[PDB]
């Protein structure tokens, strides 16, 4: 789906598969979090469904030893003194030893501060232990987490349940038309994007010799030239848009290992899984009730939340017993208006537009010489038109699919293209969609605060700050303290400070709250980027104070307070809201659960080969399933006829459904249901 999605999939740890266990065989002991997993396997990252605890992510600092066990790095302490020397330890090896937590205060030389320190011991047991007995200490605070886990700002403020979804959903973020970096980060956004292999890294140093949208060429110091080719508009495995763009300009001095051109969801070589949005924490006329989300039309009119999706459509001309399938522009009983967007071959021309039901690849097959209808024979003598022996088997656009045709790939057995035995011409047609975000599209943040788009108001309807700036997104207050994911609030506060900028007061000295605050942050520009590393970063003290240092806008006016709130004007009534609303910026990811894919409906269509029931799946234009649990709901209501209908004329009554259709189109009354063909199958299966 996105670069991170792939990276995480390379670091999955599955207990399933041959040699392992089945899903049913797995008890409750296997799945939950074990004491040994620390620094080796992430405790957070794992699926929500029936696969929970059986699929895990490998921790950041971990590695695999030649014997197939998981080693993890630890800092070595000689005698109370931390040494930079690092040895990897296996699980059982760690047990025989005694490990200090990473955040334990350390002398500028390397010695401990307090004799008794926090200590990790075998069997997941913890106890204060004198410094003389400290063998090793953890490399980093963020040692126990995975890659996707470490991108969740203020993780230590969100409960594991919503933090879990937080990780799982980032892998579901969809590449937008162009990508912004997050205002609030953890620092992991950099290394993840590079290692993902879905950006472009320079092997050897030098100078950009020539740059184009197509490729970048670099002149090394030794004289050799290495050219990197840009992936431009390619379909992913999940129909997202892998598109790379050159960062550097021509004649830039580039050093080795530097990102010269990033790809999908990447800004300046950083994981860009979404946009920075102006949020407002308030219920709003019910339109955000039960996790629903309200959006500003700006997000549509400025393609902020717009993504590109590519599909791959295929068809082939085979050898039949009545001749051979030939792809052609000549299809029986079709006007030249429909065929208008075709070439001479029978293929759609690149750049043309396609709607559902339209024709992509005109293919015709010789139909079996069966005696045509004596009533259609009769109709062919009156109008004197002779029947063709070729039936329309063309490739038409699937329902719901649409967009511009952005490429054709023809393979011909004639052109020596090695095809499977029996195929003559094989066509591929790639259509891209520029899907603007809409109602029902699943949005999310990093804190497991999911939700679908309820309503998108016109830009003027939006609750706006004093200087007339309309907010972007209106989250519901109710659904926050229930989820224990108040990190999203922390991100928002830091989000506003990162947008407005700040400046601590140095007069009368460095304030006591900003005493642990590194020098580099005591002064911040508007729209600056920062890091809040997991189990480190911003503390609640520094955050409150930063809300006091929020720089005024272009009109010299401060917009939010030290509480973090501000006063909004209802864009509908005009009157200001009675109470201060919390306002700031939050990173929002467009998830790959869009209505355009999920929506589906069917009158009639295909049917099961044996049971004569409808087929199943949106890919098969199949019907829904009215299961055993739904049958009860019917019976409990006592709606016998409706229940009878659904399980008869709507399903597998061979003669029934046909006469239902006729009755409807004739405007008559619905006939009495017959015998389910499914039941007839049973009596034949019992015999």
């Amino acid at each position: 789906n996105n670069p991170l999605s792939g990276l995480t999939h390379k670091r999955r740890l599955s207990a399933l598969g041959p040699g392992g266990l089945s899903r049913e065989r797995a008890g409750l002991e296997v799945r939950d979090v074990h004491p040994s997993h620390y620094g080796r396997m992430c405790p957070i990252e794992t699926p929500e469904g029936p696969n929970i605890g059986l699929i895990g992510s490998l921790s950041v600092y971990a590695r695999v030893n030649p014997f197939g066990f998981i080693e993890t790095p630890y800092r070595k302490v000689v005698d109370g003194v931390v040494s930079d020397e690092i040895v990897y330890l296996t699980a059982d090896e760690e047990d025989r030893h005694v490990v200090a937590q990473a955040n334990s205060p350390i002398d500028a030389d390397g010695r401990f501060v307090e004799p008794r320190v926090l200590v990790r011991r075998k069997a997941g047991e913890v106890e204060y232990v004198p410094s003389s007995e400290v063998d090793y200490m953890d490399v980093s605070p963020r040692q126990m987490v995975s890659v996707a886990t470490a991108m969740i700002p203020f993780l230590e403020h969100d409960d594991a349940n919503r933090a879990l979804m937080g990780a799982n959903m980032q892998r579901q973020a969809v590449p937008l038309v162009r990508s912004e970096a997050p205002l609030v980060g953890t620092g992991m956004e950099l290394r993840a994007a590079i290692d993902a292999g879905d950006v472009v890294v320079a092997e050897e140093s030098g100078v950009i010799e020539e740059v184009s949208a197509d490729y970048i060429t670099v002149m090394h110091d030794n004289g050799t030239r290495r050219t990197y080719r840009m992936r431009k508009f390619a379909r992913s495995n999940h129909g997202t848009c892998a598109n790379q763009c050159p960062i550097v300009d021509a004649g830039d001095r580039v050093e080795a290992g530097q990102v010269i051109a990033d790809g999908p969801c990447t800004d300046d070589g950083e994981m860009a899984l979404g946009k920075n949005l102006l949020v407002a924490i308030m219920p709003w006329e019910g339109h955000n009730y039960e996790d629903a989300i309200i959006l500003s039309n700006r997000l549509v009119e400025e393609d902020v939340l717009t993504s590109i999706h590519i599909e791959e459509h295929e068809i082939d001309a085979r050898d039949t017993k009545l001749g051979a399938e030939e792809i052609t522009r000549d299809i029986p009983n079709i006007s030249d208006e429909v065929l208008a967007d075709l070439d001479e071959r029978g293929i759609v021309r690149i750049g043309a537009e396609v709607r559902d039901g339209d024709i992509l690849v005109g293919k015709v097959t010789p139909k079996g010489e069966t005696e045509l209808t004596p009533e259609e024979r009769l109709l062919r003598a009156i109008f004197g038109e002779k029947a063709r022996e070729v039936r329309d088997t063309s490739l038409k656009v699937p329902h719901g699919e649409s967009g511009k045709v952005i490429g054709i790939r023809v393979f011909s057995r004639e052109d020596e293209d090695e095809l499977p035995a029996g195929v003559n011409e094989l066509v591929r047609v790639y259509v891209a969609q520029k899907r603007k975000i809409s109602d029902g599209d699943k949005l999310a943040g990093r804190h497991g605060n999911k939700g679908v788009i309820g309503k998108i108001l016109p830009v003027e309807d939006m609750p706006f700050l004093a200087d007339g700036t309309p907010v972007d997104i209106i989250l519901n207050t109710h659904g926050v303290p229930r989820r224990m994911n108040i990190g999203q609030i922390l991100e928002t506060h830091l989000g506003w400070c990162a947008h407005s900028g700040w400046k601590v007061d140095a007069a009368k000295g460095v304030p006591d709250w900003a005493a642990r605050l590194p020098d580099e942050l005591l002064e911040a520009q508007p729209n600056a980027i920062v890091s809040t590393p997991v189990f480190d970063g911003a503390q609640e003290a520094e955050l409150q104070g930063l809300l006091s240092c929020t720089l005024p806008n272009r009109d010299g006016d401060v917009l939010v307070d030290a509480d973090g709130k501000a006063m909004l004007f209802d864009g509908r009534s005009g009157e200001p809201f009675p109470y201060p609303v919390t306002v700031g910026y939050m990173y929002i990811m467009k998830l790959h659960h869009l209505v355009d894919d999920k929506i589906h409906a069917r009158s009639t269509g295909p049917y099961s080969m044996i049971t004569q029931q409808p087929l199943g799946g949106k890919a098969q234009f199949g019907g829904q399933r009215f299961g055993e649990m739904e049958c009860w709901a019917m019976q409990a209501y006592g709606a016998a006829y409706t229940l009878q209908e659904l399980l008869t004329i709507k399903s597998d009554d061979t003669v029934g459904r046909v006469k239902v259709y006729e009755a409807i189109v004739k405007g008559e009354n619905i006939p009495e249901p017959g015998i389910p063909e499914s039941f007839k199958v049973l009596l034949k299966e019992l015999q």
Binding site: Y61, Q258, D268, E270, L517, P518, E520, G537
Partner: peptide, 23 residues
């Protein structure tokens, strides 16, 4: 700074100094 290794944009980090080993 956080990761001052590749030639990356400067992201400032609230931190205790992390110099054990890069990811």
């Amino acid at each position: 700074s956080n990761n001052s290794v590749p030639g990356a944009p400067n992201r400032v980090s609230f931190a205790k100094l992390r110099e054990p080993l890069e990811v």
